[PDB]
Amino acid sequence: IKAVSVTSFGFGQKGAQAVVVHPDYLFAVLDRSTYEEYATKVSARNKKTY
Amino acid sequence: GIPEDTISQVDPITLYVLVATVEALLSAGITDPYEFYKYVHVSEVGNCSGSGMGGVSALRGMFKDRYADKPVQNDILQESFINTMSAWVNMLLLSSSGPIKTPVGACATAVESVDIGIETILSGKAKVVLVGGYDDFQEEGSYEFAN
Amino acid sequence: GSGMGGVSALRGMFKDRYADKPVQNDILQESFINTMSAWVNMLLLSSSGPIKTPVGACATAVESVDIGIETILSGKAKVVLVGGYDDFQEEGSYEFAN
Amino acid sequence: GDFLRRVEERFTSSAGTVSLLQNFNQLNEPEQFTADFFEKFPQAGKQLISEEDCDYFLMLAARPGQKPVPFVPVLDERFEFFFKK
Amino acid sequence: KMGVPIHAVLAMTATATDKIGRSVPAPGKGILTTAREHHGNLKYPSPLLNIEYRKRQLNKRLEQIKSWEETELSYLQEEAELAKEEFGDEFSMHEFLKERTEEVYRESKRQVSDAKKQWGNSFYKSDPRIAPLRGALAAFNLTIDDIGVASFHGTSTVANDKNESATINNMMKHLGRSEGNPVFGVFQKYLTGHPKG
Amino acid sequence: KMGVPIHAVLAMTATATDKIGRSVPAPGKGILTTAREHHGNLKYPSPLLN
Amino acid sequence: RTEEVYRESKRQVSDAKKQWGNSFYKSDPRIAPLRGALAAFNLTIDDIG
Amino acid sequence: HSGIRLIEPELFNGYDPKKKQMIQEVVVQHDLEPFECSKETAEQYKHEH
Amino acid sequence: HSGIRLIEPELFNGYDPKKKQMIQEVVVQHDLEPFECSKETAEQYKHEH
Amino acid sequence: RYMHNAITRNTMFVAKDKAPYSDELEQPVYLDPLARVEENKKKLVFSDKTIQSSQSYV
């Protein structure tokens, strides 16, 4: 799924809408080295959180 | 000039917010709210105001009054809110569609609303935004501040 | 921020004290809506970033996200908790019914 | 062997299948047995030891009637209990 | 930089006040305004949607910025001896430069990020021809045809369940969803209930 | 452009959370952070103020 | 497309202006917010009356 | 009659700080005199007592 | 015991929707039996009745 | 002028009854960021000539 909409309505006519695009399209703005280096730290954090 | 109907319905604090808003726009040289829509789109006239604990007169109604089963307005809970004031403002004056938000900083709530107003406007989300605070003094609030 | 959070304490200060049931003295500090994020900062973050508190009672957890974005993109903050919360209780249910 | 019994017990799910460890006498040369065994369980090479499988490990390391462990696994009030015995 | 799990990317978010009325509980279609735009004549389509146009613009602005920065670093030599005689008789050509050079770096970095956010992040903020809900995605070279789901508010009430669908249909219509590419409706309130806040 | 009375110009505005505690009613000096800055060495004053 | 050029030039104009006069301090530690806020108006901290 | 003054009850629906009202949980010790009431009110009384 | 279900009172301090409690404004018609109470409680009763 | 008139006649606040747009125009305004109110009959109302007009993009 590319992106998801989230609309929610409230009393007194305060409605709102969010849109959540897939994380992947973010990672493609940045070069290789940064992505790979971020991946390592993520892995480490993952084990630590586990 | 608030019509007697609305007077009879809504929480007293809403009266205060309306009578404030009208002459605020007046102080801005605005006679009728719609004048904004001559220079800005409807979705760009927000209202980032909000109370600290507004509606106490209706919270009383729904909590301590109904328990006594005193004759109480049926839909009181729609006024017990805190965004319900800006609701009435938009319903009766602006009829706009700009960003409504509603801060609650109970004591320091009218200043944080201004921060919200700025993060709103500079974002381009809105070009005009009402911003302020309001609250009402009543019994159950005073007793607990005392204790 | 909540939609009407603290109903358990609003009950305490409005319908309970009128009965003079034994009630915590400082209940009113929890009846608020920013009092939740207060406890969050007091117990976890001890930070000093921008606290705000929206109330969109039904659509309140999404507007909080808009606030979060207008906050972050403004550079006012680099991390911000954003969400909603609310509690179901009696006096709230009866009036939704009516 | 009783530890590998918990490893496979962990990394399997609703199987009711055969255990790769039927007789502990297979362990008389583990060097190759375990090496080939971790193929039926690849991610156990990358998922960390879980805690419930860690405290169990310790509980093994001090079971009665067994020769005491030739190393020290932790630093707790039982430090000498692992250090001197 | 912390190395945390990026679970999502909040592209767009807005809110709105519906329309003048006399009943708070009744909702309205105010949130539609996140997608309103301008459709008078499309003979000249807005070149700002073509990602390569913005790409080459960003490029040529970045070369300008880096040339500016390399020029100012040269300026900083002369500026030192032209402004150190007049603050202290001693010449801290070491620390004065190691201060003002890195300040040059930061003030170049800000222009870099500003050009980037002007051409890719929020290049649409001042244009009527780009509805917000489109430009939000179009930052990621996405089409309105790619909002997969629409997590509906869906409070199982009479007016809400129709109004929400009305807004979604109308806004996907105005943005020109490819016909026959509907978004799916998920309705967690069936399972979790409605957590009023 | 509307021609309204500009009564003021809100230059700055911020808010802050004070510090970890166990009492909501007691305030703190969190709002101070609107003025914190860096004072290590001023031989090269920031040219950006001029 | 000419008038679109006009608008996309106007945005860069206003962005440069807000980068150099409005919020030129937003990314700098050496400029405390409460100072830079005024300093936008060529004001000194000595002027909060 | 304007500004900080002693609270005037007619602005607050008879809220008289001198006579703030409260209800006291009290257990009866002798059955009261039977009083007439409505049908469903009697039913609710029975169901809740 | 999870998800949308009938409300279980032990999660809500005895809130039993079948027996939602209410108090009824009722005027006495025959003086009750005199009961003992505390000093200031008696004083408050007198002042408020 | 307005303030004097109002403070004399107790009509400082005039409650609006109908929105600037008409029900048939309440949506088309929402989608056009350039459609704005024009004035007639001493009233500021939305029209159709203002919605998605071809001249508001010169």
SS3 of I18, please?
Answer: helix
Q: Is B82 helix (H, G, I), strand (E, B) or coil?
A: coil
Other beta carbons less than 10 A from residue B40's beta carbon: 19
DSSP H17: G
| Residue C87 burial (CB count, 10 A) | 17
Helix (H, G, I), strand (E, B) or coil at E53: helix
Q: Determine the Cα–Cα distance for residues D7 and D52; give it in Å rounded to an integer.
A: 11
Q: Which residues of F touch B108 (CB under 8 A)?
A: 15
Q: Do the Cβ atoms of B91 and C41 come closer than 8 Å? A: no
- Could you tell me the CATH number of the domain that includes residue D64? 1.20.930.70
Chain G positions touching E111 (Cβ under 8 A) are 19
Residue tagged 């809970």 (tokens): B77
* Bridge partners, residue E10, by sequence: A20
Of the residues E7, E39, E153, E174, only one is catalytic, namely E153
β-pairing, J38-40 with J43-45? antiparallel
Method of structure determination? cryo-EM
Minimal CA separation from B33 to chain E, in Å: 12
Interface test mutation site (partner H, options I15, I24, I37, I47, max chain H beta carbons within 10 A): I24
The minimum CA-CA distance between E159 and chain C, rounded to whole Å, is 15
CB-side exposure of B107: number of CA atoms within 13 Å? Answer: 9
Q: Which of B3, B27, B107, B145 is catalytic?
A: B107
Q: How far apart are CA E166 and CA B56, in angstroms?
A: 36
Angle, helix D52-61 to helix D2-11, in steps of 10 degrees: 170
Contact partners of I by the rule of 3+ C-beta pairs under 8 A? Answer: B, C, E, H
DSSP collapsed to 3 states, B106-126: HHHHHHHHHHHHHHHHHCCCC
The first and second tokens of residue A19, run together, are: 């849109």
Question: Domain of D50?
Answer: 1-74
Burial class (CB in 10 A: 0-12, 13-18, 19+), A22: middle
User: Which candidate, C17, I32, C11, places its Cα nearest to that of H22?
Assistant: C17
Rounded to the nearest 10°, the torsion over CA E94, E99, E105, E110 is -170
* Residue closest to E162 by CA, chosen among E29, E16, E62: E29
Q: Is residue E72 within 8 Å of E104, Cβ to Cβ?
A: yes
Cα–Cα distance between B132 and B110 in angstroms, integer?
A: 5
Whether residue E153 lies in the annotated active site: yes
Whole-number CA gyration radius for chain C: 16
Nearest CB partner across the interface for B95, out of E16, E19, E125: E19
Q: Are B125 and C70 in contact (CB under 8 A)?
A: yes
Return all residues near E65 (Cβ < 8 A) that are at least 6 apart: E108, E111, E112, E115
Chains with 3+ CB–CB pairs under 8 A to H are B, C, I
Under 8 Å CB pairs connecting chains E and I tally to 5
Closest chain A residue to B46 measured between Cα atoms? A14
- Edge-to-edge strand ranges of the sheet holding E9-16: E9-16, A15-21, A3-8, E147-151, E184-186
The residues with which E149 forms a beta bridge, in sequence order, are A4, E184
Resolution at which this structure was determined, Å: 3.3
Looking up tokens 């900062």 gives C41
Q: Is C77 exposed, middle or buried (0-12, 13-18, 19+ CB in 10 A)?
A: middle
Give the Å distances, CA to CA, from H18 to A36, D28, H22.
73, 91, 12
Give the torsion through C-alpha atoms of D56, D58, D64, D65, to 10 deg: 100
Tell me the one-letter amino acid at C67: I
Query: Residue J11 is encoded by which pair of tokens?
Result: 């009509």
CB B93 within 8 A of CB B23: no
Selected residues 1-49 of chain H with any CB under 8 Å from a CB in chain C? 21-25
Pairing of strands A3-8, E147-151: parallel
The reply to whether B122 touches chain C by the CB within 8 Å rule is: yes
Contact between E18 and E1 (Cβ < 8 Å): no
Asked about B48 being catalytic, the answer comes back as no
The residue count of chain E comes to: 197
Other beta carbons less than 10 A from residue A44's beta carbon: 11
Which residue among J10, J16, J30 places its CB closest to the CB of B97? Answer: J30
Closest CA to E96 of F37, F47, G30: F47
F41: left (phi over 0), alpha (psi -120 to 50) or beta: beta
**Helices E95-116 & E51-83 angle (0-180, nearest 10):** 160
Q: Answer yes or no: are the C-beta atoms of E14 and B97 closer than 8 Å.
A: no
Helix (H, G, I), strand (E, B) or coil at C15: helix
Question: Nearest CB to J16: which of B2, B95, B97?
Answer: B95
Beta strands in E38-177 (DSSP E): 147-151
CA distance C1 to C71: 15
Nearest by Cα to B84 from B107, B66, B67, B59: B59
Nearest residue to C73 (alpha-carbon basis) of B125, B43, A4, E36? B125
> Is there a contact between E100 and F44 (Cβ–Cβ < 8 Å)?
yes
Which residues in chain C have Cβ-Cβ distances shorter than 8 Å to H22?
A: 17-20
How far is residue D23's CA from residue D29's CA, in Å, rounded to a whole number? 13
Q: How far is CA G43 from the centre of its chain?
A: 14
The DSSP secondary structure of C20-58, one letter per residue, reads T----TTGGGTSSSSHHHHHHIIIII---S----B--GG
Write out chain H residues lying below 8 Å of I26, CB-based: 35
Q: How far is C75 from chain A (nearest CA, A)?
A: 20
Asked if E160 contacts A9 with a C-beta cutoff of 8 angstroms, the reply is yes
Report yes or no on chains J and I touching (3+ CB pairs under 8 A). no
CB H48 within 8 A of CB I21: yes
CB pair distance less than 8 Å for F35 and G35:
yes
What dihedral angle (degrees, nearest 10) is formed by the CA atoms of B26, B45, C53, E190?
130
> Which is it for strands A15-21 and E9-16: parallel, antiparallel or unpaired?
antiparallel
The span from the CA of B28 to the CA of B30, in Å, is: 5
CA dihedral H16, H19, H21, H23 (to 10 degrees): 180
Nearest CA in chain H to B69: H41
> Which residue in A16, A21, A25 is closest to E14 by CB distance?
A16
**Cβ–Cβ below 8 Å for B101 and C34:** no
- List the one residue out of F15, C29, B51 whose CA is nearest residue C38: C29
**To the nearest whole angstrom, how far is the Cα of F41 from the nearest Cα of chain E?**
9
Say which of B81, B90, B101 has its CB closest to residue A13.
Answer: B90
Identify whether the C-beta of residue C14 lies closer than 8 Å to the C-beta of residue B140.
Answer: yes
| CB-CB contact of E46 with J41 (8 Å) | no
Beta-bridged to residue J44, according to DSSP, are J39
Q: How far apart are CA D12 and CA D2, in angstroms?
A: 16
- E10 chain-C contacts, CB cut-off 8 A: 65, 69
**CA pair distance B41, B126, nearest whole angstrom:** 9
E103 and F48 within 8 Å at the Cβ level: the answer is yes
| Own/partner long-range contacts of B64-70 (Cβ < 8 Å, ≥24 apart) | B64/B140, B64/C14, B64/C15, B64/C18, B66/C91, B66/C94, B66/C95, B66/I22, B67/C15, B67/C18, B67/C91, B67/I21, B67/I22, B67/I23, B68/I22, B68/I23, B68/I25, B69/I22, B69/I23, B69/I24, B69/I25, B70/I25
Give the residue carrying structure tokens 């932790």: D74
Q: Which residue blocks in A1-50 are alpha helix, DSSP H?
A: 24-27, 32-49
In the numeric block, which tokens belong to residue H41? 């009110």
Which among C27, C55, C96 is the nearest to B83, CB-wise?
C55
Asked whether the beta carbons of E15 and B85 are under 8 A apart, the reply is no
Compare all CA atoms of chain G with the CA of E54 and give the residue at the minimum distance: G8
Rounded CA-CA distance C58/E28 in Å is 14
Given a contact cutoff of 8 angstroms between Cβ atoms, the answer to whether I48 and H21 are in contact is yes
Token duo for residue E135 = 């430009």
